[PDB]
Design a protein around this ligand. Sequence first.
Ligand SMILES: OC[C@H]1O[C@H](O[C@H]2[C@H](O)[C@@H](O)[C@@H](O)O[C@@H]2CO)[C@H](O)[C@@H](O)[C@@H]1O
Ligand SMILES: O=C([O-])C(O)C(=O)[O-]
Length: 385
Amino acid sequence: SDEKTLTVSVDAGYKDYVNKIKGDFEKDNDVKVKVVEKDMFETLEALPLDGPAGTAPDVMMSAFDRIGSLGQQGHLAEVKLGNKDDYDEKDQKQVTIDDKIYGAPAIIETLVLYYNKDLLDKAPATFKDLETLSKDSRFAFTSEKGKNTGFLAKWTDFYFSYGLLAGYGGYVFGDEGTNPKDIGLNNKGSVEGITYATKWFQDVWPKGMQDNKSADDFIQDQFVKGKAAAILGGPWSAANYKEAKINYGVAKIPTLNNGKEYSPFAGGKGWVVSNYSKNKDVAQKWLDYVTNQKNQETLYDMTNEVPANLKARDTAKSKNDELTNAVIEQYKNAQPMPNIPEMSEVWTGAENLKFDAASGSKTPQPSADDAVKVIEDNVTQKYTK
Ligand SMILES: OC[C@H]1O[C@H](O[C@H]2[C@H](O)[C@@H](O)[C@@H](O)O[C@@H]2CO)[C@H](O)[C@@H](O)[C@@H]1O
Ligand SMILES: O=C([O-])C(O)C(=O)[O-]
């Protein structure tokens, strides 16, 4: 009768999963769970209006990069990590801003190296191996003299190239991504990374790799047609390679020339609670439930998304799936993207940073210095000191 209820909103891809696991939660807590399907981002963009109306769901998911911001803006409730003993400090940091926790980590993801097993005997292990692969004429791009598609990476996109700069010692914001007055994108390390990228753009790759607007289309087209042997990509692309029947393999990103690992952004998703919810106690119980080992293993079983819960992540690793193994291994070297507001100013500035050098229009040092000045000035103008 008056036996409480909880509204759980998820993207279409998680509806079956939530329906499978809700039963045991309902029984364990004397609650009725209502499952609604809605695009993840649309739910979050509507929250500021649905919340005061009393029409927003009680719990939903969010990419890690938005949790801090939604928490600061007052749209998400502070929550506890019931499964803290099963989370690395890095994953706790993903859902934390200003020493306040606004979600429970659920899924991890990062960039990996996809390769074609019909073209290569094994995954390249280092960037030195990729450099030699780029001189194998079986991958020559004949319409442009001396260009090669052996290895491709969308380095005009800062989301992709960040891990290269970071592998050399670059960083976005100092104090582990929390100090917007300390920008590391023009430090010695970042410039070494930019310089290395520029060699690929200028000496190896087809001209099309410099056009950020169409580079992803070019890269996917080459890999899916068996013309690129290895490429940098996210887990989200695997489904497409499966659809196209490519005998693809997946590996950690090869080791950089300095002996350090590529250090991409550590992405993923967490479960969050509406700050407007009238069912926060039950919502807290839901977060602790859905992020426990059993339910995290079911998540992986149903969706192939890598669990945040470490006990569940080990179980996923034991399945010996290449994409899962690559993501788990590479995630060890991934750092969280800053979740502070000032991160919004990094994107436009970082475009120029990579492009001006990639195109040979500026040398790497002024390309980086000029872009950092753009970012710094925007931070000063738009945000409180
Ligand atoms: O490219 C920048 C963007 O990459 C990732 O977003 C993915 C997303 O996870 C997928 O669902 C699909 O839509 O492809 C997107 C990229 O093409 C990151 O999650 C995101 O933070 C980042 O800005
Ligand atoms: O259930 C609760 O925790 C309470 O009703 C609230 O969310 O305000």
